[PDB]
Every structure is written in C-alpha cells, then in structure tokens.
Design a protein around this ligand. Structure first.
Ligand SMILES: Cc1cc2nc3c(=O)[nH]c(=O)nc-3n(C[C@H](O)[C@H](O)[C@H](O)COP(=O)(O)O)c2cc1C
Lengths: 161, 168
C-alpha cells in the first residue's frame, strides 16, 4: 500500500472553531465536507487530542471559516501548530460570535458557516462530527485556498494575483 | 443562510466502485476524504437511492479511483446515470479486481484505493461509509481533477489553472 496515493485526495483548508466554558478554541482542518442537502449537514473530522475537538464534544456546536488563497503562512501556523488552551489564538485576530455561540473567524475568510452537532461518529483517533448548518455567509470575492495550494506554499511557492 | 457559502467547500472528483450479487457497480462522487492515518481510513458519502450505495452496504467493501484532470466528460458521464446496465458502465473500461472483490477502475485514474468497511454513519438521505484502506497505488504522474474544475469545464469556462499562479 503506497501512502502517496492518499496524497491525491483533494481538500480545502479551513479554521474549525468552538467555545466551551468561556474558552475559545480553533484549529486548522482540511477534513471538512458537506454530506447532505436535506437538511444541510456539514462534517468535520477532528483528532481526539485537540482542544477544539473537546470544545465541540462539550458544546455541541462548531464554526467553519473557509480560508482565502492569500492567507499568510503565519496565520495558518497560529491555528494549526499549537493548542488553544496554551496560546491565545484569537488575541490579535478579527472574529464575531455566531448564533450558536461559537467564535467565527472572519479574518482571511471567504465564507463562514456555523452548525449544531446532530451526530458524532467515533472513528478511533478522531471523531467525525456531523453538524446541521444554522447560518452561513459569504464574506469576500476571493479565491479559496486548497490543501494542494498549501502544499505548494510549504515548498516555497507563493500565490500571485 | 446563504447557500453560496457551501459552494466554497473544496472537493475532488472520483469514481466509487463496489460489487454485489456478482454485479459490478460504480458512481461518480465528490465526497471522498481520508479521516485518519493510524490506521488509514477513508470515508465515502453515498446517496441511499444509488445502486452503488446498496452494493457497498451489502458487500462491505469499496474502491476509489481519483480522476485525472483530463478525464473525458463522456467517461465521467458513463458513471453518472441513475439508470444503466453493468455492461453499459464497464464495457470497454480498463479495470482490475482487488482481493476484496471490488472492481478497481484504472482508466483515467491518477491513483486507486481499496477499502473494507469498518463503520457506517447514517446521516439521513445518505450513508457515510468508513473504510479501512487495504491497498492503494499511484498509477499516473497526471494532475487530479477537482470538483470546481469539473464545474467550470462542464460549463465551458477555463479551469483554475488560468487564474491561479504560483511563483517562487
Ligand atoms: C494544513 C493542516 C491541516 C490539518 N488538518 C487537520 C484535520 O483535518 N483534522 C484535525 O483534527 N487536525 C488537523 N490539523 C491539525 C490541527 O490544526 C492542530 O493539531 C492544532 O494544533 C489543533 O489545535 P487545538 O488543540 O487548539 O484544537 C491540521 C493542521 C494543518 C497545519
């Protein structure tokens, strides 16, 4: 089995957020997808070790920010390479509070979606959360950042507009 | 709630295959994603009304072909008919059969993955099947076809490659 074959699967890049006990949590995720349209349900697959996973488990709600093509690498690192309980990820970033109570990061977001958890599917090291969308808004006309794009960024390339 | 926000979510384009009662099945899908790495698990979300959904439900296995950027629209069309025979779908298509029994379509595929179902997540109109990967191979050096690409091309527009440029 060649692990490189899995590298061929396509994804977007997002910030997944939640709040529990007054503590805001957010993390980068590429595993975010719509599952159904009746009603609209979105899935996010979060590692059980993550602070954001536990906030979603406790609060039953999550937000999703779809990152723009020009999102800086330091902004992705702010959310994707440290824990929410150990570094104040939201201090210094623009965001608002959704109807569900989750923080919705608007900085560098082409769109934001908030959902309430209607099902949890335990897949071992991660929990796949199924959320029914409660609100969604398009914020910018910008191109979205794909996971493949981010990998070109890792290799040093930079988007040009 | 603006529906356009959901169109900002990114997907690939794939053929999901299975076999039931000695009959090969396959459908185009955009909702295929890796869930975990230890062990490697892949999820595919299929509509309950599709024959492939029922084949996966009965057999407990599925295959995924990751389509290349230049896949002919006619080829994608073969696997998108809610009504067609097993012959109409696979006649003249290059494929092989894995140990799990599913047909792995290699034609126009950058890679193929074979998985055994280890969990089913019922989400109403669809079922999300969680499969443990049992084999996987890269078949071509080609670029992959994304769902957004397919949409632009289908209409007639120019693929993303026309506006997004990466310089060092
Ligand atoms: C490009 C990228 C993609 C990631 N994708 C996922 C993902 O889909 N699911 C996940 O649980 N973690 C993913 N991570 C890891 C989390 O962002 C990371 O572990 C983060 O530190 C968790 O923060 P938290 O503990 O505050 O929730 C990704 C990280 C990066 C940089």
């Amino acid at each position: 089995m060649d692990v490189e074959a899995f590298y061929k699967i396509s994804y977007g890049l997002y910030i997944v957020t939640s709040e529990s006990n007054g503590r805001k949590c957010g993390q980068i995720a590429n595993t975010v997808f719509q599952l159904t349209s009746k009603p609209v349900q979105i899935a996010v697959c979060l590692n059980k070790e993550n602070d954001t996973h536990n906030a979603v488990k406790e609060s039953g709600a999550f937000g999703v920010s779809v990152l723009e093509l020009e999102t800086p690498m330091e902004f992705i690192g702010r959310f994707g390479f440290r824990k929410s309980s150990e570094f104040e990820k939201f201090d210094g970033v623009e965001y608002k509070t959704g109807k569900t109570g989750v923080p919705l990061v608007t900085q560098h977001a082409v769109a934001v979606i908030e959902a309430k958890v209607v099902k949890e599917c335990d897949v071992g090291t991660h929990t796949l959360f199924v959320g029914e969308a409660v609100d969604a808004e398009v914020l910018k006309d910008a191109e979205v950042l794909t996971y493949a794009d981010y990998h070109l960024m890792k290799k040093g390339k930079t988007p040009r507009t």
